[model samples]
Every structure is written in C-alpha cells, then in structure tokens.
Target: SRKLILFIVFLALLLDNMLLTVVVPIIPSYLNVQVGLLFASKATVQLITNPFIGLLTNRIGYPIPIFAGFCIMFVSTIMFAFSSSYAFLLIARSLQGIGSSCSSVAGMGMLASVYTDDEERGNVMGIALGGLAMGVLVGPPFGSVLYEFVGKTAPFLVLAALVLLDGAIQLFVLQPSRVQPESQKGTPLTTLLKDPYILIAAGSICFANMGIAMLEPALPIWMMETMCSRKWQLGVAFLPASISYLIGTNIFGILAHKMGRWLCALLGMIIVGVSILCIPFAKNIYGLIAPNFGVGFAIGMVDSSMMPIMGYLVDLRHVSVYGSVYAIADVAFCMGYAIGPSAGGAIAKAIGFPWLMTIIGIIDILFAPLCFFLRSPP
Candidate 1:
C-alpha cells in the first residue's frame, strides 16, 4: 500500500514539476522580463490563489477540485501555445498556477490521508518526494529538447495533455480520499499565520525556492552567453545540475525517513547553502552541475520532511490548511521559477555572470539556518 501511494505521488509530482521547469528554453522570448519582472509576476498570481484553492478543496472534497484543476491547466496550456502577447502569456501562466495549486492541494491532502502510522508516513512521503526530484531532473532537459524539435507552444500543449491524462488516471485508478477536512469558516489569514512552525516551514520553502528561481533562469543563458559555441551545449550544461538533483531527492527520501523530519530538513538547507556557494565559483559546465546536485538534494530532503509534517501539525479535519501551507511554499518556489532565468540573464548582461553567481550563492548560504526553526513535536 505504501509503495503504491509512493508511486502515484511520484507521478503526480513529476507532472507538477514539469509545469514549472518545462519553460526554460523560451522564457526570454516568451515572458519579456529579464529577471526581476519574470518570477515577480508568477508569484503575484500564485500568492493570491494558492490559499483560495486550498479552501476550495476543503469545502468540496478532493476529487472535484483535482478534476477542475486539470481542466484549467488544459486551457491555460492551450492559451500559452497560441497567445502572441506577453501579457496573454502571463495570464496563461497565472491560470496555470491556479490549476497547479488546486491539484497540488488535492493530491497532497490525498497523500496525507493514506498514511496510518507516523513512521510509515515519513518514509512514504520521502519515497513520493522522489517523484518531484525526478520531475525536476527530467523537465528541463526534456523541455529543452522538445523546444528544439517542436517549438515553445508544443511543450505547453503536451504538458496540458499530460495533466489531463493524469486526471483521467486519478479518476480511474486512484483510490478515494479517506479524510474529509473541515472548512475554514472564518479564520482570518492572520489567525492561520500565527503557527511558528508553519511559518518556519514556509520560510524554509520560500528561501529555498527563491534561490532556485534565482539560478534556473541564469543557467541556460549563462551557458548560451559563455559557451554558446554549440547549440547542444546549453542543454548539455544542464546535465550536472540535473544529475545532482536526482541523487539528492532520491537519496534524501530514505534519509528523512530514517533521521526524523526536522533533521532531514536541516541537512537539506545546509546542502542548498553549499551548492549556492559553489555555483558562483563554477568555471565550466561541470562546475555548474556540481553545485546544482547539492541544491537539488537539499530541496528534496526539506520537501520530504515538510509534506509529512502537514499531517502531524493539523487535525485530520483541517487537512486543507496543511495543503494550503504546501501551496504557499510552492508559490514561494514559483518566485524562483519566475526570477532565476531572466534575472541571471539580466545580471549577467549588466555586470557579469561570476559576480551574480557569487551574490546568489551568498544569499542562499545565509538562509540555511532558518530550516532548524521548522521543528515541532507532533
């Protein structure tokens, strides 16, 4: 049963991760922002809808929300494929963010519902978190290749179909939700805001994602600017980062389950700090991939621990709040997705890649200790 749940969550996360990373090749042409405006806009919409979608899941239960999310994802992808205006593209992405938020909340809440024991929960969450790592590993390279063969629009269209297909599989193959969360009737955002552990978790996810957002945009462009001698080099450069990410996420699952959630998260943050510090010093493609591995590993560990904690911290009846918290962290991550590439490009354009890399790495290292605060007795 645990294995089955892990596999399904893995697939779901793969699809989810694809939504963000698949756009790496075309951001400069499509979005029009160099960096500051890019993820700035993504965070704009996601911050708004993430909690709303979570509340919706709590009110209506999981199945319908999941289905609806996929539907929106489909439309958003279609719009992104065809839209000529940058504004329209942004709108499409915003809507896609909403879809992802709804589906994530439903899927995560469902994941939480399946666990019967605390120990089992940690292990299972880690295993499933592997899927997210896999998605990160695959999404960029695959998307870049697809963009090379087809076009920018082709990737999003294909992504839409995949989301729809996942929804179909969920309907046919996945089991029903076992827990129904109570609705958040009138609690102000400030009330839910008071949980120190929740805030810590949010901060951990937010800074980690911010670092990611800061880097991803920079990577390909950096390669293009620095090593654009060959068309293939850009995608090839991604290999080191991708491989490291896979190792980190896949391995971190087992570590988190074994070491306890808080400890796992702490390690994850430390790894991120190390990677960030290393990235600026990266003189070649191989050097770039080395740091990414550490960053990816750290992210995977924190995610593995954090997902299970949602269940521990909240009542079974208020599971949606936990899901909302996950969405909030994710939205935090989108901050990076929005910023990383374009900002890297712009910063590299203005000053130089080395200095920008150094600054980002330093900020990432500074944020590592915040993960320790996420610890709470369940």
Candidate 2:
C-alpha cells in the first residue's frame, strides 16, 4: 500500500506539474502577456491556503483531501484549457494552486506518516520526488509539442483525461486514516514556525526552488536577447537541468547520509549560485547547457536532501502529524515560487537581465550557510 500510495503521489505530481510546464514552452503564444501577474496569482493563493489544508488533513485524514484535490485540479485544468482573458488565467492559476496544495499536502503527509526510518524515508522521498522531476522533464516538451501540433486546448484536454484516470484509481486504493484524538489537537503553525530546524529546512526549501521558479517568467526573453533563442528552444532550455536533476534525485538522497544532508544542500546551493552566474554570460544557446545542467543537478541535490529532511525534522522535534509540518514545507516552497517569478520579473524589468541573475545567484550563495545549521535538535 505504501508503494501504491507512492505511485499515486508520483502520478499526481506528474500530471500537476506536466500541466504547469506545458505553459513554459508555449509562453510566447499565450504570454500575450503579469507574466508575474499570471504566475504569482497561483502561488499566492497556494501559499496562503496551504497551512489550513494541512490542519484539515489532520482532522479528516489523507483520502478526502487527496480526492478533494483531484476535483479542484480537474476543474482548474478545464478552466486553463479554454482560458480567454488575463483575469481568467489568474483565476485559473489561483484555483490550480489550491488544488495542488490539497493533493501535495496529503500525499506528502501520508508518506511522512508511513515512512518511519530516516534513511529509508530519504530514499523513498528522493524516489517519489522523481515524479516531480519527471513531470518537469516531461511537461515543457509535452506541452509545447501538443500545443504546436494540435492547438491550445489539446494538451490540457489530454491532461484532464489523465486526471480523471487518477481520480478513479485513488477512489479504489485509498483507505482513509484519521489521526488519533491525541494528535487531533495537532501542532500549531507557530510551533512549527518557531523551531530553528524547521525554519532552516523551510529556508533551504525556499532557496532550492527559487532558481527555477525565477527562470520560468524571466528567462526566455533574456535568452532571446543574449543567444537568439527561438520559441521551441524555450521548452528545451531546461532539458539539461532536468536530466541531471533526475540523476541527482536518486544519488543525493543516499549520499546525504554519508556526506551529511546539510553538506549536500550546501554544495547544491553553491552550484545553483555558480550556474546562475554562468547563464547570462553565455553567448550562444549551446553554451547555456552546462550551466543549466549545473542548475538542475544542484536543485536536485538540495531538494532530494532537504525534502526527506523535512520528514525527519518532524519526527525528531515536532509531533509526527506530518500534515502540519508538510504544510510548512509546502508554504515555503510556494512562497519561493510565489516570490520568485514576481520578484524575478520585477527585478529584471527594473535593472536588467544580468544583474537579476547575479542577484539571485548571490542570494542563493549567501543563504548557503544556513544549511550548516540543519542538525537535529538536541
């Protein structure tokens, strides 16, 4: 059943993010124009809504939340399929944000509840997260290709169909487990927020996602200027990173035990920073690959190590409610992504592209030291 839950979690993420990345490659066609406005709208709602979803999961248990997510995401996907206005897109993105939080919180919450051992938890988490990388890898090209050949609604229609299949499997497989009455009291958000380890983990999660999140809204036009990137090329731009990110997901989780998860996180941040610095300097598209690969691998390293660490931090210091702690994890991830594009787009628009990338790189590098603070509370 753990494996079953894991597979479902993987599929959920794949479909969810596959829907997300679909837009990236085809942005020129639809970005027809908040790039920040459209993107931030989703994360803003998710960031605000995630905490309550976690609390709700503890009260209701996983299956209900998971199914609820399916319903909302299905509706949201349909909205995105035929969106006709900027206001409409914002509403759709925002709706997807809430739907994503429901499944994501419950899925991760269930995993944390089931996987008791730290090393094994890390291994399983790294593996499950591969679903995310898979979606990321699969999304852009899939979205772009489907959009190119079929038209606007085709890719989303297919994604919507997949969601329906996911809903059917979830109903059969899920057996809801409510937390005990003792745990029903649950960990308060402030309790999770006050813990130094939770804060550090949250911070790293934010920084880990901050780079790619920034790239989605800010990268393409900069690429157009710097390397003369074409529309098809935008989708593939992330290919190098996704490839190494996939590899890093498997490797870093296991290696974290030997080298220390904190060290993997630290090393990963350094690479993200260094790679960000390299991106703007590239004179041609080919020159962008190595640095982008560095970006992806480092993201993989930070995420693979840190995410499992999220589960451990809860087991060790906080109650194993999982939902609440994961909510924190979800919030931080949302906030990074939330702030990333809006901030990225705003900064680039104000100053220039090189400075923006350099600023992001510098911040990631600056934040790298906090990973050293991640040891369990004594």
Question: Could you say which candidate leads in lDDT?
Answer: 2
Candidate 1 lDDT, tens digit per residue, 272-377? 8777777766667667666766776677677667766656666532333455555656565666555556666677789976777667666656766666665653
Across 65-155, the per-residue lDDT of candidate 2 in tens digits comes to: 8988999999989988887777777788888888898888988888877878888888888888888888877776687688779988899
Question: Which pairs clash (backbone N, Cα, C closer than 3 Å) in model 2?
Answer: 34-37
**What's every prediction's RMSD, in angstroms?**
4.3, 2.7
The clash tally of candidate 1 reads 10
User: Whose TM-score is greatest here?
Assistant: 2
| Per-model lDDT | 0.66, 0.82
Candidate 1 lDDT for residue 72: 81
Q: Stretches of candidate 2 above 4 Å error?
A: 23-35, 82-88, 175-184, 229-231, 376-378
